[PDB]
């Protein structure tokens, strides 16, 4: 990799600078280089990795949705192959980013992650990037991509329920994203609603155990569960 000659600590430092400068493609390249050094990642480093790729793929997803909408309207005056071609170009670049993230998780972040906070984080990430692949999938692969997302989310859920309190922000973010998977991807709106409700209620009952700062962290994510429940019901 082009980052192979840079020190691990310098890559992490530059990822933090790239975040401040809103240079998320650079941030992702620096964090990919850091992962490829072969050492495990601290909590802060895992979050730098997630921030970088979430911003990159988020821009791609937003662009894909704009182009997909234009393409669908055109298929209800014939304008030639250009809309399809350009939607495909963006789609292929999005798939490539998802494949890069999944490859880092498989080589070798997940297999070395033994603590709940790291293992759940990475398995959630695996579910998320298969979910982004599912959003654009149509061929003989959508079903297998959906099942890969489901399997990663389910393993993360099983660990999170055994090893983390119901207010833990990683556990809450996982449940939130799995509920979105159910509603948007898996055609299971009832499962989505049930998961969001149970997650919210069990977190509410555990807030009394938390410090002022942890209370703020957990309630911020609980509000997203509530907002989705308002949209879905």
């Amino acid at each position: 990799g082009a980052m192979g000659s840079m020190e691990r600590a310098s890559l992490i430092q530059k990822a933090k600078l790239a975040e401040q400068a809103e240079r998320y493609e650079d941030m992702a390249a620096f964090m990919k280089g850091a992962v490829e050094k072969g050492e495990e990642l601290s909590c802060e480093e895992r979050n730098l990795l997630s921030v970088a790729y979430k911003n990159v793929v988020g821009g791609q997803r937003a662009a894909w949705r704009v182009l997909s909408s234009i393409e669908q309207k055109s298929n209800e005056e014939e304008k030639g192959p250009e809309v399809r071609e350009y939607r495909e170009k963006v789609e292929t670049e999005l798939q490539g980013v998802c494949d890069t993230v999944l490859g880092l998780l498989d080589s070798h972040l997940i297999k070395e992650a033994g603590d709940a906070e790291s293992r759940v984080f990475y398995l959630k990430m695996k579910g998320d990037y298969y979910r982004y692949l599912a959003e654009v999938a149509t061929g003989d692969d959508k079903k297998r991509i959906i099942d890969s997302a489901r399997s990663a989310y389910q393993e993360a859920m099983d660990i999170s329920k055994k090893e983390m309190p119901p207010t833990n922000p990683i556990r809450l973010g996982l449940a939130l994203n799995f509920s979105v998977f159910h509603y948007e991807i898996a055609n299971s709106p009832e499962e989505a609603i049930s998961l969001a409700k149970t997650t919210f209620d069990e977190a509410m009952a555990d807030l009394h155990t938390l410090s002022e700062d942890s209370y703020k962290d957990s309630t911020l994510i609980m509000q997203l569960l509530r907002d989705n429940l308002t949209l879905w019901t």
């Binding site: 979050n47 997630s50 921030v51 979430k54 911003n55 998320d128 922000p169 973010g173 996982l174 939130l176 994203n177 509920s179 979105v180 509603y183 948007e184 989505a192 962290d217 994510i221 997203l224 907002d227 989705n228 949209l231 879905w232």
Partner: peptide, 8 residues
């Protein structure tokens, strides 16, 4: 669209 987890 449904809201997913935000960056921290």
């Amino acid at each position: 669209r449904s809201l997913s987890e935000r960056l921290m």
